[PDB]
Amino acid sequence: RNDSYTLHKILPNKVDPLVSLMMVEKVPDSTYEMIGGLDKQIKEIKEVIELPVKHPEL
Amino acid sequence: HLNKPSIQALIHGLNRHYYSITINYRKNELEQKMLLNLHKKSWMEGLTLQDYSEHCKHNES
Amino acid sequence: TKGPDAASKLPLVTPHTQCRLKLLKLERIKDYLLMEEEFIRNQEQMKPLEEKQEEERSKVDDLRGTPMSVGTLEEIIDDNHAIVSTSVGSEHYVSILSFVDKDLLEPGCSVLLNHKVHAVIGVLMDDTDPLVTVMKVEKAPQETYADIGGLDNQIQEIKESVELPLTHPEYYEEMGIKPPKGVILYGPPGTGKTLLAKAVANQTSATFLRVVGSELIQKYLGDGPKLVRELFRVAEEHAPSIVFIDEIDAIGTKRYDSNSGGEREIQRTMLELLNQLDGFDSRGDVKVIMATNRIETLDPALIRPGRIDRKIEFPLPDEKTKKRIFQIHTSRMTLADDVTLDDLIMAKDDLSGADIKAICTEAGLMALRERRMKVTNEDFKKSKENVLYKTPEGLYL
Amino acid sequence: MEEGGRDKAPVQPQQSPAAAEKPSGKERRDAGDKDKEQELSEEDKQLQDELEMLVERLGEKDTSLYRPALEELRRQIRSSTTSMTSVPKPLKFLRPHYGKLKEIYENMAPGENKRFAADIISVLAMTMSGERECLKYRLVGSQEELASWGHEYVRHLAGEVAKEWQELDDAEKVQREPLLTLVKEIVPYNMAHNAEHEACDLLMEIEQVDMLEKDIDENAYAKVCLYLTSCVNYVPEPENSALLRCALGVFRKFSRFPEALRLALMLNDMELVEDIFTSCKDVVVQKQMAFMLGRHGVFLELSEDVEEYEDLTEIMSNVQLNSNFLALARELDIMEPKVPDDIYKTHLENNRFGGSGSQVDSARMNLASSFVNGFVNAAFGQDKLLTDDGNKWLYKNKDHGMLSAAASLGMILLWDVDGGLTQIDKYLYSSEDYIKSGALLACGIVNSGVRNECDPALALLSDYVLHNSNTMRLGSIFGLGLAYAGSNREDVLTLLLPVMGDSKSSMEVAGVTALACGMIAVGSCNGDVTSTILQTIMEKSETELKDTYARWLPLGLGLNHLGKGEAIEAILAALEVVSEPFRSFANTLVDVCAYAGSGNVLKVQQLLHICSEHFDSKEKEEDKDKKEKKDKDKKEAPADMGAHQGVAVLGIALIAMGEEIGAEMALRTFGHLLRYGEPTLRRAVPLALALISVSNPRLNILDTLSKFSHDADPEVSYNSIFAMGMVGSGTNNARLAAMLRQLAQYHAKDPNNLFMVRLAQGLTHLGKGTLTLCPYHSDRQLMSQVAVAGLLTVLVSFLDVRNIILGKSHYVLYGLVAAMQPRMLVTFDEELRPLPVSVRVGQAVDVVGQAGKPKTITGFQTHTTPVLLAHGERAELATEEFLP
Amino acid sequence: KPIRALDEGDIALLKTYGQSTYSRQIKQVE
Amino acid sequence: RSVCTEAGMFAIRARRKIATEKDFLEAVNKVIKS
Ligand SMILES: Nc1ncnc2c1ncn2[C@@H]1O[C@H](COP(=O)(O)OP(=O)(O)OP(=O)(O)O)[C@@H](O)[C@H]1O
Ligand SMILES: [Mg+2]
């Protein structure tokens, strides 16, 4: 509070603005359908990016 | 008890060393009517037309 | 002083094949966890104990007021007044009230002060600013000396430095040698330094304080040395303790004539760390362990024999250590019988422990590529060059 | 998108069921589908099964709507449909794919039922059908345990799949058939036990160590009660007989864990074979230091089975262990110096200055010095320091000081028949009551599991067993109770049943007689049971309520009833439930004491549910005390898997938030739970921290005591430092706190000694060892036992103790010096490999040495290989065609 | 060779078939 | 001084109460020559 210093609310966890701006809030418009070649590269990137996240059971 | 004491005053000793006395403003009709002249425009601007060119520009905007 | 910390749960891994022996063991663990939960729940369900003193406590609190700002007792004067520095840094000559434990006032202890008319109104022995609290290990890492392959000499030296003194130290003063205050791990990256630190923190009986090295540096002036001082004060306060400062070269680099205020503050932080490392006696039960890859770039005063006597070398794993590491990291795998694993170990390379782990992971991925999980030898064969990216042929033949 | 190149599979294995009427096409397509599913699931190591994934969706509609098929042929075409439907079991069907097994592979068997399965490596009907006969068979045995033939044909199917699991792949699934038998055949466990008996014992001999390790680890933590805990205990009985190596001294182990069954099982596992007795079976006898009756069974009554009949008995009893221990102390490892109390009580150099005198010969400190001197030189025949010239030293105490000092003097010459009595002959005519009673204590002390043929304790104390003097009776009955710790012969029962049944003896005397008889017999002794209960009935309410010794009477009852399950405890609760509210304490003592190692929830669920939390806010004193003391009873060592969260639930919950009077001293439990010396685990934090907190007197005194556990041989470094931090620098002024501090923290120096009840192998406890339970209830009482010097014999009662030495002999003597590898324990046995108990060398001692539990040894370089493989401190380096 | 992304059926079959019969209770208990 | 300390350490390593000349030799091989 103002100067009585009495805890009167709990606020969400502190992330400083500089790193909160780093979240990709507005997704970019680039699909794999706009990537020529790189099919092997795309599969390799997926085997590290999405396969562990989507299914860690394997 | 109509008005609430503030936290700032409370920390600085209100209701512990001194009490806040309710303040009432003695304002009779004469003083009110005289103070009303501060923003009483005039008998003139009630008849003074706004600038027609500025009127047209305001209307267009 | 109080005792150490870092409670961990049971090793389990007595089996690892999920042959229901794991199931009885984890069932015993979960059942006893339920017992703890039920006991504490039912305790707080019926636990009437409050008030008692009340009015005396009520009036001492009324004297204390609200809020009460914590300060650092920098100096004491005749036993009614003292010098205390607020967390801003400004220090005031204040009075000490009657109800404070004069035995507890000691330069450095956090003292509760009245918000208005500052006065010592209480002593906090557990300030422990959130940074140093975070730097303390609570859940010990799951790795263990069984997980480390090779590094027998390294494990042996690290245990002689930071296990033997905490356990029976009678040999040390029997031989008249002081225990080694501080050890430093060095070698090429991914050789087992941080892994050995995890293993030590697992089979430990002392407070383990993990530090990033670069974490000690702070933006505000005087926050760096203050943080180092608080960290080591916690280490002594929770003795015996182990202070692990990973990547010591983040601050341990060559000392040079500072010009900028930031460089001066970095030099001051290192000077405070070195002075603190000198401060506690080697007979004391607080040991420091620092790891780095660029050993040569360290200050040759941080590695003085009077300060950090031991120096554990972590060479790239040999063929036998490579095969031990491969046995460890393929243990969980459902390897086919055709895999030999000796061709990869043969290949004269700079495979590290991390490189072997990555080779195993890539082999598993390649097996998943063929829809199988049996992981043949061909998967390892391709995985080796898949991971190992990057002498002109017949020069040295 | 599909593979395209092999897009025939979503066509031909798709059109064949889709086109599906004409019986000939039906048979042909079913045969082709069988062949394709077999060729895929059986050798194609790819987990993914092209048909099984492409049969699915279609399978759950076609092969389910075509599952009836109207049974076109008698069963052969129906056999084809079942063979097809037994392919998409894992993912096509719901959780009751075990019902798929019921009506697809249990109802019918395609010839050799595993014709399309035993070919499959582990999946189709081995890991899968293993899952189904450990899930379907589990629920059916839960609800329809004795079903129609659906329980017997499933039993035989489980039998062949279980044995094939050993001989279809011959792989580490050798750890899954024991698994299956544990889960499969939930009530008919013994049927599967005999199944793997007749299979594995005849299949191959090396594939049985895995069987033993599996069943042993399950024995550590089996189901809650000994209906299948007992059955798993009995599982290795075929796996130890001539079907495997016959020596296998582990007969003592899997007889000890099941109620220490001597005269029903040990009659056959060793008493009947008696054929390789000249081999390690003699050291099996030596490593059997609990059950003298076992060798009395054949030896004395016939004396013709082997020439080493009574000589072998005597040598393993005490004499040669004493001789080789003395050789270890003087001849081999020269650590046998003159070590009195004074040599290390002032081991601090702080006590030299600042005393300004402070040298007082008062009762508490002189008593503590006598106790310390006796403890330190336990089993030492060299402590001629406070023994011979110290007659006045024995005189310079208070009344109980004489009895305790003389008992300590007897303790000096532990289990020594010659030296003990030739040194107690001088003090036998002590010419003083209290010293005389201490002398009878000493005579009953040199009989610690000695099992003397001459029986000196009986005759030498029978003059005073009922003699009209409380101190005489105390000393005599306590000495005799310590003498007969192992057996329960009818002579001592017919001698003390009058005694504790005598009303002349006081209730302190009655309680110590109860302690005696309770550690005499560890079975039923219905005479003892009835006598103790008619005691607890004929005593008057105030006496049985607030005697301060009323604990020892149910304590004696429980100590008699320790180990055996709640069978006798049921009627014991029935005829103690009629008693005073003190019967709550009595029951929560005896019942839980009937479990030494019974690591289970339900019993500790009563202790921490109905006995702990239904007593936290309730001021019924000393009900919570035994509660939390025995929280680690039945949990003292379930392979220490159940000990660590015992530490957690005690420190976190009990010490931190417990009652100041019923649970604040929940701390001698730590003494009982695990005793080696471990910072922040058993000793440093939980004991030292509460020890500095001297706010509660009883807590502080008992907590200083609790280091007695680790104090058997703690390598006193970091423990002596504690003592010097509290002697002079700590609870120095508090007379009683300083007294217990001296006693407890200083009796560490007793070298090569070990108080833990759990045996050297670690998988068996020792009931004779567990008789260090009276100095837990008494030690917690602290009133007229420890803090008040009412009776200090309970502190003397610590002669449930074994050496911690090592030694190797070859049929003659200890002269063998083969290299040893003592170091901390690691993984072994049930993992992929039995990695040696020591991860590396550590110490490379070749001579006989010391081995505490976190230091276990392995043989070296294969010279005179011991067939004992137990190193019970007396290993037998029996030679063979060594280096073959 | 163009390596095929594991299908939903492929994920489902990898999660089963080649699994210990105690994966479910072990994982749940932990 | 660190060489002497390491010689003591090597003596402790073999669990011997007395350090030998061999321990000092390996200690000076360790500390000296870095
Ligand atoms: N001897 C070893 N046995 C088993 N695994 C090892 C061994 N050495 C390294 N590893 C593996 O390497 C991985 C990474 O190693 P680690 O984190 O210890 O690196 P490091 O050598 O400390 O390097 P850096 O500090 O430069 O990052 C570990 O997770 C571990 O699995
Ligand atoms: Mg690292």
Tab-separated table of N, CA and C in Angstrom, chain C residues 156-157 160 164 168 171-172 174-175 177-178 180 305 310, chain F residues 2 4-6 8-9 11-13 15-18 30:
chain	number	residue	atom	x	y	z
C	156	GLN	N	38.198	-39.776	-7.704
C	156	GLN	CA	38.993	-40.047	-6.515
C	156	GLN	C	39.542	-38.763	-5.907
C	157	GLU	N	40.089	-37.881	-6.743
C	157	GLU	CA	40.612	-36.612	-6.251
C	157	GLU	C	39.502	-35.727	-5.699
C	160	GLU	N	38.500	-37.027	-2.381
C	160	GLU	CA	39.498	-36.697	-1.376
C	160	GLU	C	39.451	-35.232	-0.986
C	164	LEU	N	36.110	-36.579	1.787
C	164	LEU	CA	36.866	-37.112	2.915
C	164	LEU	C	36.946	-36.163	4.104
C	168	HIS	N	34.989	-38.734	7.940
C	168	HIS	CA	36.067	-38.849	8.915
C	168	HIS	C	37.339	-38.140	8.467
C	171	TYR	N	42.406	-38.632	9.402
C	171	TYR	CA	43.659	-38.842	8.684
C	171	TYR	C	44.376	-37.526	8.434
C	172	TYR	N	43.622	-36.454	8.215
C	172	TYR	CA	44.227	-35.211	7.758
C	172	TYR	C	45.077	-34.576	8.852
C	174	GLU	N	45.946	-36.333	11.506
C	174	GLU	CA	46.888	-37.386	11.861
C	174	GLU	C	48.186	-37.217	11.088
C	175	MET	N	48.080	-36.875	9.804
C	175	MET	CA	49.257	-36.638	8.982
C	175	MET	C	49.738	-35.201	9.062
C	177	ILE	N	48.505	-32.597	7.609
C	177	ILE	CA	48.212	-31.807	6.420
C	177	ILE	C	46.841	-31.167	6.572
C	178	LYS	N	46.717	-29.929	6.117
C	178	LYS	CA	45.419	-29.284	6.115
C	178	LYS	C	44.568	-29.853	4.983
C	180	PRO	N	42.256	-29.797	1.707
C	180	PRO	CA	42.421	-28.875	0.584
C	180	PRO	C	41.252	-27.918	0.479
C	305	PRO	N	48.733	-21.727	-4.762
C	305	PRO	CA	48.707	-22.919	-3.901
C	305	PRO	C	48.197	-22.636	-2.501
C	310	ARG	N	44.439	-27.850	-5.182
C	310	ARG	CA	44.189	-28.939	-6.109
C	310	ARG	C	43.788	-28.403	-7.476
F	2	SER	N	52.809	-26.920	-0.873
F	2	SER	CA	51.777	-27.692	-1.549
F	2	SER	C	52.281	-29.074	-1.935
F	4	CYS	N	54.453	-30.846	-0.157
F	4	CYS	CA	54.372	-31.625	1.075
F	4	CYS	C	52.932	-32.021	1.379
F	5	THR	N	51.996	-31.095	1.180
F	5	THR	CA	50.586	-31.410	1.385
F	5	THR	C	50.124	-32.518	0.446
F	6	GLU	N	50.539	-32.463	-0.817
F	6	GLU	CA	50.163	-33.508	-1.759
F	6	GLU	C	50.807	-34.838	-1.407
F	8	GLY	N	51.366	-35.846	1.664
F	8	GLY	CA	50.440	-36.333	2.672
F	8	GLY	C	49.174	-36.899	2.057
F	9	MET	N	48.655	-36.229	1.028
F	9	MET	CA	47.446	-36.703	0.359
F	9	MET	C	47.661	-38.072	-0.266
F	11	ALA	N	49.833	-40.269	0.710
F	11	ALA	CA	49.922	-41.222	1.808
F	11	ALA	C	48.539	-41.617	2.309
F	12	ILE	N	47.635	-40.643	2.417
F	12	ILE	CA	46.261	-40.929	2.818
F	12	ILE	C	45.569	-41.786	1.774
F	13	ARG	N	45.889	-41.562	0.500
F	13	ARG	CA	45.270	-42.307	-0.587
F	13	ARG	C	45.458	-43.805	-0.413
F	15	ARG	N	45.981	-45.097	2.474
F	15	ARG	CA	45.584	-45.346	3.860
F	15	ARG	C	46.768	-45.815	4.700
F	16	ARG	N	47.907	-45.153	4.531
F	16	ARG	CA	49.094	-45.405	5.336
F	16	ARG	C	49.314	-44.215	6.254
F	17	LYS	N	49.636	-44.491	7.515
F	17	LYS	CA	49.834	-43.417	8.476
F	17	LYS	C	51.149	-42.679	8.275
F	18	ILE	N	52.091	-43.251	7.533
F	18	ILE	CA	53.404	-42.657	7.323
F	18	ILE	C	53.616	-42.503	5.825
F	30	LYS	N	53.516	-34.406	-9.463
F	30	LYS	CA	52.191	-33.842	-9.696
F	30	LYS	C	52.227	-32.319	-9.678
